[PDB]
Every structure is written in C-alpha cells, then in structure tokens.
C-alpha cells in the first residue's frame, strides 16, 4: 500500500513484475510476516521475478 501511494504521488510506475510483502509501523522498520511458503509458490506461479 505504501509503495502504491508513493508511485501515485510521482506518477512513476513501479518496476514491472516486482512482488513484495511485509508490515510497516509508522517509521518503516519492516516486521516479519508468516506463511511464507504459500506466498512463495503463488509468486512463482505468477512469474514475478523479484
């Protein structure tokens, strides 16, 4: 969501085929998320490279 807004703020598209995930806590220190194997297989299925 953050990177979404930021892209919109400047109009620059995000670099293509870039998936990401995480959590942010009002100062940007990303925090762990769980279940990573399932998101991993989904990303491999979608062809996203990064």
């Amino acid at each position: 969501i953050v990177t979404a807004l930021l892209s919109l703020a400047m109009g620059r598209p995000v670099r293509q085929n870039l998936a990401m995930t995480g959590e942010v806590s009002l100062t940007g220190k990303i925090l762990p998320v769980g279940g990573i194997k399932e998101k991993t297989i989904a990303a491999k299925r979608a062809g996203v490279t990064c």
Partner: protein, 50 residues
C-alpha cells in the same frame, strides 16, 4: 499446563520413531527440534534497534 502438552508431544513422536522408525534412541536437539513441533510461534522481535 501448556508446556506439558509440548513435552508429551515430543515424547510420543519419539515413541513412533522408536516403534518402527529408523531410530533406536531419540535424543532431541535444538537443530532437529524443528521436525518435532514445526515452526516457532513466538519471536524475540526487539522491534527497533536504537
């Protein structure tokens, strides 16, 4: 109480690894412990550094 459940679970899986597995004497260790209960629940976050 809840510790009691994890202890008995570690034991019973040792039992099945005795009865017909490829183990004559289990000896749980921190590296192989992951197999016996799977992914950790709680973490040691230390959400920030300074």
């Amino acid at each position: 109480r809840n510790l009691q459940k994890q202890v008995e679970k570690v034991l019973r899986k040792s039992a099945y690894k005795i009865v017909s597995g490829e183990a004559e004497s289990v000896e749980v260790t921190p590296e192989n412990l992951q197999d016996f209960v799977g992914k950790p629940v709680f973490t040691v976050e230390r959400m920030y550094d300074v």
